[PDB]
Amino acid sequence: SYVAHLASDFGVRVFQQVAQASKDRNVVFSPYGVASVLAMLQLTTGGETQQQIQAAMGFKIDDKGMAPALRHLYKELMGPWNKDEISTTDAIFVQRDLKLVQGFMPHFFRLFRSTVKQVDFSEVERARFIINDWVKTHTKGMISNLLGKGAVDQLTRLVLVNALYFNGQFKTPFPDSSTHRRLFHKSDGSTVSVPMMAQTNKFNYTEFTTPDGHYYDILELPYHGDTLSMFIAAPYEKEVPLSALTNILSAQLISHWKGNMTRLPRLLVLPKFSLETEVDLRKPLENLGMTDMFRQFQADFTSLSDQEPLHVAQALQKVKIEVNESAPEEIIMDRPFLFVVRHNPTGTVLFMGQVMEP
Ligand SMILES: [Cl-]
């Protein structure tokens, strides 16, 4: 509830910075994931660096209830109870021969039930592979090469990574016997021919206006388990750019969508998509106030090391999502549109993305 909203709202704001910077390119992101690893980060920071993170996220991780809330949240989401195909990894790596604050590790581990890993970034390629293998093996082998070539070097002292793979199955899946190349109309007027799925069913649907007055469709594709949903949304009119919608998104608005949904017999035309995005969190986080964490001597990580100056050399998220098959009105998404994977009991925005070109 409370912390699920803070986390989601925060993550949706990060998504927006990412979106406003790749205005015409495919993006998949995880609001929840970036909130999770920046909450971890809070434990390692101090002074103004810590205050920046806290002012942007809306809560302090060491307040009572805060951390236990987040763990209960994690167990609510990643519950093999749901037979869920979410695989997730968070991880902070720090240079090996720096004296860590006594008492930090046991504390970090009690709160998050994971640990900060120590490696030697002086073996540049060996350390890149240790981190990559760690991410790969902890995402069911789905997320490879998170750290690209030259992403780390001898001076690298602290690296933050977040990786997610999601392959849910729609409660009511699209029948393959109904997929066909259709004209998809891109943000720059030019069109292209992509395969679009289609299905006539009793879909949850509603429509909203932007603060500007532009109309848009929202539709909810529930997943097996009755717990997660994908929402698909796009301005009805093609001359209105998807950004008019992305710019007004929030975790609350998304809750209102769900709240207004009604079950209506509809024809849905929806392009298949396979997205894999690596997002460099630096610029987006910087745009939200968190600037110090990236500056060599101004960054305060004195909760992690009281003696040696640390700064974040890389903060990276890599996400992968595959959306495939497993007198009604028509909703045709032959334009750029948004998607959101939502955990409805808590209101957590797990995934969010835009398809500008499938
Ligand atoms: Cl557009």
Tokens for 114, please give them: 């994971």
Q: Which CATH architecture has domain 28-165+276-320+329-338?
A: 2-Layer Sandwich (3.30)
Record the resolution, in angstroms.
2.3
- CA distance linking residue 196 with residue 94, whole number of Å: 45
Single out the residue of 231, 343, 286 nearest to residue 49, CA to CA.
286
DSSP label at 223? B
For 328-337, b/e burial (b = at least 16 CB within 10 A) is eeebbbbbbb
Ligand 1 centroid–CA 192 distance in Å is 14
Ligand 1 centroid–CA 218 distance in Å is 16
Ligand 1 centroid–CA 1 distance in Å is 33
Ligand 1 centroid–CA 294 distance in Å is 33
Ligand 1 centroid–CA 157 distance in Å is 40
Q: Do domains 28-165+276-320+329-338 and 166-275+321-328 have the same CATH topology?
A: no
- Which amino acid is present at 132? N
Ligand 1 centroid–CA 279 distance in Å is 21
- CA distance linking residue 96 with residue 93, whole number of Å: 9
Ligand 1 centroid–CA 186 distance in Å is 7
Place of tokens 């060996």: 126
Q: Quick check: 163 and 318 in contact, CB under 8 A?
A: yes
Integer CA distances (angstroms), 170 to 72, 83, 224, 231, in order: 25, 13, 6, 12
Q: What backbone phi and psi angles, to 5 degrees, belong to 38?
A: -80, -20
Length of the chain in residues, anyone? Answer: 358
3 state SS of 197: strand
Q: What is the SS3 string spanning 144-177?
A: CCCCCCCCCCCCCCEEEEEEEEECCCECCCCCHH
Q: To which CATH superfamily is domain 166-275+321-328 assigned? A: Alpha-1-antitrypsin, domain 1 (2.30.39.10)
Tokens for 59, please give them: 């809560």
**Rg, C-alpha atoms of the chain:** 21
Ion ligand 1 nearby residues (CB, 5 A): 187, 241-242, 336
β-strands 348-355, 27-29 pairing = antiparallel
Ligand 1 centroid–CA 357 distance in Å is 10
In a 13 Å sphere around the CA of 179, the CA atoms on its Cβ side amount to 14
Tokens for 42, please give them: 């809070």
Query: Which residue ranges make up each domain of the chain?
Result: 28-165+276-320+329-338, 166-275+321-328
Ligand 1 centroid–CA 43 distance in Å is 40
Q: Which helix (H) or strand (E) holds 3?
A: helix 2-19
- CA distance linking residue 147 with residue 129, whole number of Å: 8
In 123-272, beta strands by DSSP E: 158-166, 180-185, 191-209, 215-222, 228-235, 262-271
β-strands 314-323, 329-332 pairing = unpaired
